[PDB]
Symmetry: C3
Subunit: 256 residues, 3 copies
Amino acid sequence: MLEAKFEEASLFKRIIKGFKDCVQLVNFQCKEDGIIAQAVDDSRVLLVSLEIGVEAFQEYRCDHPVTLGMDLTSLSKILRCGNNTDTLTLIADNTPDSIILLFEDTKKDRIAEYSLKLMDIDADFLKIEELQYDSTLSLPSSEFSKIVRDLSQLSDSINIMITKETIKFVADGDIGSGSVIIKPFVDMEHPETSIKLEMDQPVDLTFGAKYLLDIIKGSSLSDRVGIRLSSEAPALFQFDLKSGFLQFFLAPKFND
Amino acid sequence: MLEAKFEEASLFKRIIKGFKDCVQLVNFQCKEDGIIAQAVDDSRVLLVSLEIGVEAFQEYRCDHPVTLGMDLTSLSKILRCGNNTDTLTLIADNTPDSIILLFEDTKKDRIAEYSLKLMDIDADFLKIEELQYDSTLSLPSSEFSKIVRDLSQLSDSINIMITKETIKFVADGDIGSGSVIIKPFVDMEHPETSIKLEMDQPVDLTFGAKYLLDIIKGSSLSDRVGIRLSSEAPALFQFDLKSGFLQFFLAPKFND
Amino acid sequence: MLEAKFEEASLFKRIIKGFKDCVQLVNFQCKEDGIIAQAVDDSRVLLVSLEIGVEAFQEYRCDHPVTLGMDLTSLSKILRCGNNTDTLTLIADNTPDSIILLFEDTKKDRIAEYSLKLMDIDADFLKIEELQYDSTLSLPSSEFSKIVRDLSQLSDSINIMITKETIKFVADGDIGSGSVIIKPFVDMEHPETSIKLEMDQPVDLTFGAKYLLDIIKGSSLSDRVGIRLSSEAPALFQFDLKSGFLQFFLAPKFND
């Protein structure tokens, strides 16, 4: 059996929002220590990887590992079905016919129990994170979201440039162009709005704006975003859950 | 002559919202004791029936009965034309060339008088309400609306099931499935949120979700909804106005 | 060189909203005393004319006159790129390769500098305002916007009628019809909501509702709108900036 109770369905709803642009069929491996999931998109330039730990739940029990594969169109539909504050419970049995999602409320009324038929997906799991990235940075999710959104209207390609104490976002398209230059600093009032940067090697990479627009949906889950860039491997954008994470690996646009 | 003044145009606007999915041509019989109207839809599975009494108005005068038939596309358009708090007045003369809608405001400015050309509709009025329905229930309009809306995303058919002290809404479609089980109780704090049920015979009927989605638009007009279900006749969903009602008769889906 | 700093980008964003329905290519003449611009639409029935004076800015410097022509689709896109309270600065050099738009914020972070490639437009400037219009009136932008919007749903033509102390807006189409009659008065509490009218000659003109809908977008820029109507020339609708204006000249519909 398996029973995992989120204190608030909002968290799972936002996490699943994080997958709008992958293969709508996604495997969720549920183990003794929590849930992991990963999904690639069609073009195979973007990988989404989620880990939710035991303590991110309100309650959690997984007697034996169980892989449940779900259609994210349909799970996303079923996840519109309650107030963000409802306690959401995933329930399954040893070999799962189907996953159960049970919503509960502040009031003692209205049991809302949904089911989702599980699919059979072949699990080709990707371990593509690097040890040392060329540069690491972190900044408020809100700020990163605004930068991406704004620059997205000028061209279909956003270019990240890292030099000593200088982070430069640039969109250069037919109509016009735009640049946003931020620099590291500590804001002692709220260490939230702080901007951190470690640069082992300067970097200059270009990304499809469609995919950055997808990636910034994770702002709903964390105050800060972490960006690891290197010229060799795909770039990593990470939003941290209370004991967990949602990660977006994105391959830079090719030059030719 | 005929002159009927709603204290607030909001009420008539919401009532007319209740007709979005009928023959856009609708007869309004205005009599000494108020207004009645009824409209069937194309497929002829849903009937909408409205009664507004003298006391639901701010003022009312109908010297002689007058039938005024209107295009609800066009009346709906003309009903976007003022603040919800404007005093709205319907005006007509003995044999009506046209209906007049006169908006007035808190401020003494801005007379806004619209007209609508009347059509000739043949009045085939339906008296299809039963004496004894198999089961009767009542519950908050908000709750019924949420249940219908949620379950509507899983299949195109919602199934109502009534057993002793148990009301069960169920949608079972291709992607997944959903169930919502409520039970009767008295909430003394707010007798609003109370859920009432009388069951003379258990019932099990299925309804097109398109039509339940249409029917729940009446939540704007009442705190509670009444549902009379029987296996013989069409089901009745009723929202009560201050001395009036808006009723939706809906024929269950056929089994075959 | 040229450097013009709006205290708040909101103002320029709303001004440019005022041009949604012109030739998307628009000349901006920048002179010692401020900025002027004008744009005709395709059908050539509507002219939009803007003047912004030195004092409407937070800072202003124009060493030599410079004509910069811009695509308003693209400038409108680039103008979504900041908070309404950002200080927006237009920057150019003697013969302009490109215009620069520099956003600055309350916080010392995030330099956001965009560029727009300039086009070559031939400047056929129109001086079509009359000395004496047949009638002049002024009324709250909100009220004019509501009247236009409401009446726009009944027909594609709105008809203005001016008689002694009587202003009458009328839409008369297939579905129904609507009339709105306002009269001059002084409201001493707020001289804003006052309605002023000088009538040298009664007037009766008809206007495409598409174009009135376009014109009312200027409500964002002023509390009041001024309307000069005459039977000879195109009608003038004027919204006043703090030392400036946005004007819409609109030719009446032809009778035939």
